[PDB]
């Protein structure tokens, strides 16, 4: 086509989606990770995670308002990844890398798994 | 913070949101523009448009599944802007610029209004 493109559009959309999340506006699911709960938008979760894409395209699970993650999933690891989904920013630290990598593997977030593997290999 | 950032994340999220829209997955509103109907995600509309941000933060209108636009709004103009919302790509042409600009003004999409004004000024 003969379209023009607004460079910052995708980033501005994501910033507003994060603002809606922070204000609990039109959030439609709560992700339960052991004792912790995280409110989010199903569409953002699906757009970022192979696991959530699978769950919310399921004819029964698409209608659930609560999703309980595997008890082995670390809440801080999930929190870091949820923030990444809504911002493109990953808070990767020596103290959380193993939990972040395991959570990204479970959530099927290939690019996160990739940088975790690379950061781990550099420290060995 | 000490975060790392994935450059293509925002663009990849938007691409997946557009894929969900094309497959009518978790769309939660229909925008009626005279004889035409457009299915979308309220969160994406709010993230792109001052008008939709106002409508879906309203305590009564947030719960509506149908939104009827002003009868003066051109369906093709709306279609072009809806595509822009989900892609960052604006199909701006001599034959549609007036309708696109009027629709962007109504929807409160300042950056679109700006490029329309600039393209019009260049042709006078």
């Amino acid at each position: 086509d003969s379209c023009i493109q607004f460079t910052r559009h995708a980033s501005d959309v994501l910033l507003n989606l994060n603002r809606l999340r922070s204000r609990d506006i039109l959030t439609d699911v709560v992700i339960v990770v052991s004792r912790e709960q995280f409110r989010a938008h199903k569409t953002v979760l699906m757009a970022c995670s192979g696991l959530f894409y699978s769950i919310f395209t399921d004819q029964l699970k698409c209608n659930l308002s609560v999703i309980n993650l595997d008890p082995e999933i670390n809440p801080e690891g999930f929190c870091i990844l949820l923030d990444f989904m809504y911002t493109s920013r990953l808070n990767l630290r020596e103290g959380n890398i193993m939990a972040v990598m395991a959570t990204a593997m479970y959530l099927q977030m290939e690019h996160v798994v990739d940088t975790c593997r690379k950061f781990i290999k550099a420290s060995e | 913070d000490s975060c790392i950032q994935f450059t293509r994340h925002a663009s990849d999220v938007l691409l997946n949101l557009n894929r969900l829209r094309s497959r009518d997955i978790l769309t939660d509103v229909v925008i009626v523009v005279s004889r035409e109907q457009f299915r979308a995600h309220k969160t994406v509309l709010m993230a792109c448009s001052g008008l939709f941000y106002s409508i879906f933060t309203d305590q009564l209108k947030c719960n509506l599944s149908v939104i009827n636009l002003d009868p003066e709004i051109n369906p093709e103009g709306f279609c072009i802007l809806l595509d822009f919302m989900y892609t960052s790509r604006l199909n701006l042409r001599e034959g549609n610029i007036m309708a696109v600009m009027a629709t962007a003004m109504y929807l409160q999409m300042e950056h679109v209004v700006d490029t329309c004004r600039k393209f019009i000024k260049a042709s006078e």
């Binding site: 379209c3 023009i4 493109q5 607004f6 | 790509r89 604006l90």
Partner: peptide, 4 residues
Amino acid sequence: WVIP
């Protein structure tokens, strides 16, 4: 705005 750019030519993509």
